[PDB]
Amino acid sequence: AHFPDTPAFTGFNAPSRIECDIPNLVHEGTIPPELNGAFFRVQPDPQFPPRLGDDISFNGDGMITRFHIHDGQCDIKQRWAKTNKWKLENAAGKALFGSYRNPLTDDESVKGEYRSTANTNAFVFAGKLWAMKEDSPSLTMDPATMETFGFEKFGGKMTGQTFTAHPKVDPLTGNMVAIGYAASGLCTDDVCLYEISPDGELIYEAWFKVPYYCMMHDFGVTKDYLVLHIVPSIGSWDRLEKGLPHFGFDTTLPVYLGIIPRRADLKQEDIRWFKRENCFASHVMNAFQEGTKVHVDVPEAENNMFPFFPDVHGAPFNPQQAMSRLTRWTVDMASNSDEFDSVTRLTETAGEFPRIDDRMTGLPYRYGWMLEMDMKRPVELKGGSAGGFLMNCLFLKDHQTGAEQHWWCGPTSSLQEPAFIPRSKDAPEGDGWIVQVCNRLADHKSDLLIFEALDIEKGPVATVHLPFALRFGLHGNWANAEEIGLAA
Amino acid sequence: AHFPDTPAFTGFNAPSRIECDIPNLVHEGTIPPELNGAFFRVQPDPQFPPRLGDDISFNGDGMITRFHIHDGQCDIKQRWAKTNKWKLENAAGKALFGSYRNPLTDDESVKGEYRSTANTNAFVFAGKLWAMKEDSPSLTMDPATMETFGFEKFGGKMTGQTFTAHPKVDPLTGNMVAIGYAASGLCTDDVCLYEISPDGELIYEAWFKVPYYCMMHDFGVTKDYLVLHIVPSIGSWDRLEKGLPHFGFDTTLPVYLGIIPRRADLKQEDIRWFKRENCFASHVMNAFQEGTKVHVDVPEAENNMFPFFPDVHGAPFNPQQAMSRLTRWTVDMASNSDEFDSVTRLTETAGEFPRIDDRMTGLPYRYGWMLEMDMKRPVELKGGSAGGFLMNCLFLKDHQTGAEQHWWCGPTSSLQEPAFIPRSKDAPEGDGWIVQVCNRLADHKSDLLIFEALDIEKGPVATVHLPFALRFGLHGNWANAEEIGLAA
Numbered sequence: 018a019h020f021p022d023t024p025a026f027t028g029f030n031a032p033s034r035i036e037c038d039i040p041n042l043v044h045e046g047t048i049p050p051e052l053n054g055a056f057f058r059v060q061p062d063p064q065f066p067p068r069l070g071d072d073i074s075f076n077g078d079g080m081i082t083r084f085h086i087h088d089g090q091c092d093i094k095q096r097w098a099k100t101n102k103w104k105l106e107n108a109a110g111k112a113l114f115g116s117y118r119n120p121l122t123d124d125e126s127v128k129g130e131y132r133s134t135a136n137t138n139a140f141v142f143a144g145k146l147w148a149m150k151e152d153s154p155s156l157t158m159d160p161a162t163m164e165t166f167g168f169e170k171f172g173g174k175m176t177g178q179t180f181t182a183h184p185k186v187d188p189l190t191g192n193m194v195a196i197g198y199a200a201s202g203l204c205t206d207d208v209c210l211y212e213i214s215p216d217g218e219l220i221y222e223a224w225f226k227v228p229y230y231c232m233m234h235d236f237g238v239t240k241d242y243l244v245l246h247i248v249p250s251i252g253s254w255d256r257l258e259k260g261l262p263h264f265g266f267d268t269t270l271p272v273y274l275g276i277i278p279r280r281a282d283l284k285q286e287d288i289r290w291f292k293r294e295n296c297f298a299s300h301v302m303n304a305f306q307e308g309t310k311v312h313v314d315v316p317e318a319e320n321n322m323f324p325f326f327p328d329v330h331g332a333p334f335n336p337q338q339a340m341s342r343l344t345r346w347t348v349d350m351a352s353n354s355d356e357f358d359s360v361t362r363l364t365e366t367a368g369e370f371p372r373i374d375d376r377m378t379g380l381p382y383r384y385g386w387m388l389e390m391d392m393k394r395p396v397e398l399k400g401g402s403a404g405g406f407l408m409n410c411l412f413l414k415d416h417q418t419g420a421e422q423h424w425w426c427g428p429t430s431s432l433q434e435p436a437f438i439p440r441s442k443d444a445p446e447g448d449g450w451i452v453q454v455c456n457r458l459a460d461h462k463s464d465l466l467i468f469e470a471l472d473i474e475k476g477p478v479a480t481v482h483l484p485f486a487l488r489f490g491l492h493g494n495w496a497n498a499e500e501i502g503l504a505a
Numbered sequence: 506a507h508f509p510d511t512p513a514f515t516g517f518n519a520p521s522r523i524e525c526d527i528p529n530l531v532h533e534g535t536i537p538p539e540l541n542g543a544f545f546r547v548q549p550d551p552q553f554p555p556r557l558g559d560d561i562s563f564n565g566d567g568m569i570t571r572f573h574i575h576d577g578q579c580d581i582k583q584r585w586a587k588t589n590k591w592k593l594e595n596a597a598g599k600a601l602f603g604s605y606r607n608p609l610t611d612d613e614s615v616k617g618e619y620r621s622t623a624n625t626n627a628f629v630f631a632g633k634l635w636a637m638k639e640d641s642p643s644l645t646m647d648p649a650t651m652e653t654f655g656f657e658k659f660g661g662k663m664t665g666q667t668f669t670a671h672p673k674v675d676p677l678t679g680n681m682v683a684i685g686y687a688a689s690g691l692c693t694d695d696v697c698l699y700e701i702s703p704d705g706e707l708i709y710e711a712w713f714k715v716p717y718y719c720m721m722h723d724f725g726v727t728k729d730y731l732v733l734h735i736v737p738s739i740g741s742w743d744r745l746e747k748g749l750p751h752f753g754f755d756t757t758l759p760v761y762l763g764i765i766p767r768r769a770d771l772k773q774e775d776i777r778w779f780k781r782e783n784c785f786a787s788h789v790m791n792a793f794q795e796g797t798k799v800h801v802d803v804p805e806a807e808n809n810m811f812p813f814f815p816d817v818h819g820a821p822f823n824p825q826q827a828m829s830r831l832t833r834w835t836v837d838m839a840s841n842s843d844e845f846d847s848v849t850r851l852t853e854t855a856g857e858f859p860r861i862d863d864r865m866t867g868l869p870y871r872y873g874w875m876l877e878m879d880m881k882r883p884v885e886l887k888g889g890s891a892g893g894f895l896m897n898c899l900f901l902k903d904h905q906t907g908a909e910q911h912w913w914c915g916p917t918s919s920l921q922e923p924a925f926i927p928r929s930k931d932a933p934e935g936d937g938w939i940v941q942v943c944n945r946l947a948d949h950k951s952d953l954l955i956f957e958a959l960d961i962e963k964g965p966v967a968t969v970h971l972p973f974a975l976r977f978g979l980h981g982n983w984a985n986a987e988e989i990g991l992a993a
């Protein structure tokens with residue numbers, strides 16, 4: 018393959034495309050014998066060179082990595098998420114779909130097809146592996162063989178065109194709660210709220226509209242509500258016609274927080290929209306209710322975090338203003354005005370990729386983990402981030418005491434998103450382990466790190482070496498072996 | 506897996522164990538559209554940590570790499586050679602066989618089993634891939650799927666216990682010509698000469714004895730003769746009982762060259778043994794007859810080239826004396842004495858891993874390629890050699906004119922054995938391409954280089970990037986697609 022000599026395709030961003038199997042990876046330390054299951058994660062990784070001769074990181078085909086941990090060892094299986102895009106391009110031997118979220122640039126032969134790269138999450142639910150991309154229905158895969166099933170349209174009961182890559186599982190019911198924005202077509206203001214039974218059946222789909230079309234990448238869920246931030250990374254057909262990146266950030270638009278009832282009978286009039294001054298937030302650590310209030314914890318930045326989705330008025334990217342810090346947004350459903358009740362920074366550590374013990378989804382909670390950008394640490398090698406942030410620490414916040422733990426990966430490495438592994442179904446919050454990929458940039462390889470989740474400062478208890486490098490990853494999740502067809 | 510923190514298992518020698526598939530590897534330059542076939546090569550690569558807690562490079566399980574070149578692209582498939590050792594250890598989840606060529610160190614449960622790691626050659630013949638190790642019958646594999654068949658004992662017609670990893674194909678008949686030393690048991694002085702029909706049937710097996718048991722790793726073949734050098738890397742059960750490496754070099758023993766008729770009716774009295782002063786040679790570039798003389802071209806060193814098979818009298822390894830230079834040994838079958846007719850250095854370039862256009866096997870020939878150790882070149886990174894030689898150039902010798910070509914891989918790389926690809930069955934000698942793996946040590950990855958075989962100084966015409974590193978390799982070979990079940 019002849020790939021471009023551009024940053025999106027060179028160095029740490031060289032295409033990999035490895036499908037492989039390796040049991041019993043070389044490792045150091047002690048892999049807890051308690052562990053029996055697998056950590057799935059996804060990297061964008063281009064099957065073919067881009068039609069345009071350049072592209073962005075977020076547009077690579079999804080490659081799924083599974084780390085099966087069992088018997089004190091770690092195995093890897095890596096396979097493509099075989100989206101319709103992947104299959105059509107594989108058959109043609111070339112790229113057919115064009116630039117990011119831009120159907121104007123697709124070959125005529127794929128007009129109307131799902132454009133998904135299934136590249137943003139590798140999530141386990143209802144016995145399936147979900148390889149997810151927010152512009153289409155999710156792909157599903159067999160979590161044991163990692164063969165691909167196809168797109169999940171729930172027996173035709175789903176009528177929205179899209180499905181999120183940030184599904185939540187409600188611990189009270191076991192339902193998956195999801196959204197799909199641009200639900201009636203590209204750049205539309207329609208959104209669907211979906212709930213899916215533990216057995217994989219669509220329970221309901223509820224339609225509503227948002228203040229403006231924007232990247233609705235993540236969201237929170239509480240007992241009663243979908244908690245949907247409206248942040249002005251905006252797109253339009255006009256941008257696409259002009260050849261601009263689909264999304265661009267508008268510093269002049271307000272940010273909203275929508276509180277949408279989790280009800281099949283939802284009507285637009287049931288929604289409350291709270292409004293605040295412009296800022297940027299993407300991911301949600303968790304949301305929960307307290308009395309008539311809703312709290313959602315997000316890494317908030319002063320301005321855009323996506324340099325490749327630039328300021329719509331032509332401003333150069335501002336890295337300092339892109340530093341996000343975990344912040345609690347509180348709204349009161351009983352409040353008279355549309356103002357937020359409070360906005361409260363929860364840490365001065367800058368960070369992103371927030372995670373919780375997912376048993377606490379929607380509930381008051383004590384612990385959160387993040388990737389931290391610690392700009393005071395030495396750096397001899399940089400890499401691993403699509404936007405150029407160096408994620409060099411694992412951070413744990415204790416909301417009860419305020420305490421913070423930090424673990425730095427050293428001066429030639431960077432880190433990928435952590436994932437929490439509960440010790441058992443009924444173990445206390447945070448009792449378990451954290452796993453995450455570490456980019457060993459000087460060695461051009463990756464490790465899987467395993468930490469005791471509440472004692473990270475001493476470093477990982479096991480380090481699993483991969484004999485090759487993973488690419489930049491997005492989201493990942495642990496599932497116990499019995500949830501994924503792997504051995505007891 | 507917990508592997509030792511010793512040189513045989515760290516850095517460039519970290520275990521890899523990658524089984525993978527990647528079509529359409531990222532590449533630069535122009536892969537000749539003429540190419541349609543595959544280059545196979547093998548790396549020792551330990552499935553499990555060694556029983557003893559340390560080991561040598563030559564003892565790793567064979568991992569077979571196939572580079573399928575077709576349609577101007579290169580694909581990789583990598584799979585284990587599933588020897589009986591591999592299978593038994595895989596089932597047990599641990600190492601069962603011990604140190605190199607030392608059955609005293611095996612678990613009792615594998616007493617009597619073939620100890621082969623099939624780690625020394627990946628050779629194509631009779632529609633099969635042969636994964637070869639000189640202590641056992643060869644393993645065979647499907648060259649298209651790379652599944653393993655098992656050990657080839659030729660329908661029970663083979664009675665020797667061993668089979669070489671340096672098979673030759675006689676261009677006059679298409680037969681494979683092979684030896685098997687230690688043919689009646691470990692450290693025995695019995696050797697078999699085998700010829701195998703193009704259809705894979707054993708034609709004959711002829712037994713003889715050699716002056717002393719030693720590592721009979723390679724040999725030459727001519728129209729009439731097996732040409733067998735006897736070089737005193739010697740082994741014994743006494744060494745094994747003392748816990749010494751199986752082989753050690755004895756500077757006090759003579760070197761012989763045996764000229765053994767290629768005849769099923771061979772008797773010991775038919776063999777001529779020529780004798781010379783001690784030296785070291787391992788590989789054979791080619792051998793051929795001229796009148797009543799036999800010529801064989803070998804990289805000759807003053808002393809041992811294997812530091813891990815040390816001097817038997819306790820001398821420290823001498824790297825300067827380990828420098829080998831291609832040298833023609835000539836004996837005359839009509840000569841009265843046992844002296845060689847001539848010993849003539851053919852180049853002052855130090856090098857090893859000699860290769861020819863294999864259509865010239867046994868014939869007078871013009872071209873030879875080697876890996877050169879050019880000690881005058883700068884080196885910022887070292888790696889890639891089991892004995893510590895830096896193989897940093899590709900070298901071509903023209904025996905007609907004397908001319909030499911050199912291509913240096915640069916200061917952070919090293920090279921693996923080249924292999925010649927003929928343009929067509931009837932093309933002139935040397936008309937075709939050279940392929941070889943290049944270790945990009947600073948990048949912790951490997952490339953496959955493709956050269957115009959007689960114009961190497963301009964560098965490779967294509968560079969195929971692998972997104973991971975291969976380990977040190979031994980021998981490899983190209984086969985056309987129609988010889989290996991791959992597409993026309």
Ligand SMILES: COc1cc(/C=C/c2cc(/C=C/C(=O)O)cc(OC)c2O)ccc1O
Pocket residue numbers: 061074075076136137151234299300322369401402403404405406407408491
């Ligand atoms: C893969 O495709 C999509 C991805 C996403 C989101 C990715 C994401 C990435 C980062 C990277 C940080 C670093 O590298 O330091 C940060 C974020 O929030 C601040 C993000 O929301 C959105 C649409 C896609 O189509």
Ligand SMILES: COc1cc(/C=C/c2cc(/C=C/C(=O)O)cc(OC)c2O)ccc1O
Pocket residue numbers: 549562563564624625639722787788810857889890891892893894895896979
């Ligand atoms: C894999 O197992 C076996 C291998 C061989 C031979 C390997 C070989 C290696 C080198 C390496 C050079 C470097 O690294 O620079 C040089 C040689 O001749 C001078 C050799 O004959 C022999 C027995 C085995 O059991």
Ligand SMILES: [Co+2]
Pocket residue numbers: 183234235300491492
């Ligand atoms: Co996300």
Ligand SMILES: [Co+2]
Pocket residue numbers: 269329330
């Ligand atoms: Co404006």
Ligand SMILES: [Co+2]
Pocket residue numbers: 389391410411412422423424425
């Ligand atoms: Co920190």
Ligand SMILES: [Co+2]
Pocket residue numbers: 457462463464481482483
């Ligand atoms: Co590592």
Ligand SMILES: [Co+2]
Pocket residue numbers: 495496497500
């Ligand atoms: Co679980």
Ligand SMILES: [Co+2]
Pocket residue numbers: 671722723788979980
């Ligand atoms: Co050899």
Ligand SMILES: [Co+2]
Pocket residue numbers: 757817818
């Ligand atoms: Co002696």
Ligand SMILES: [Co+2]
Pocket residue numbers: 877879898899900910911912913
């Ligand atoms: Co040279």
Ligand SMILES: [Co+2]
Pocket residue numbers: 945950951952969970971
């Ligand atoms: Co490369």
Ligand SMILES: [Co+2]
Pocket residue numbers: 983984985988
């Ligand atoms: Co051929």
Ligand SMILES: [Mg+2]
Pocket residue numbers: 171172217218
């Ligand atoms: Mg269904």
Ligand SMILES: [Mg+2]
Pocket residue numbers: 659660705706
């Ligand atoms: Mg047979």
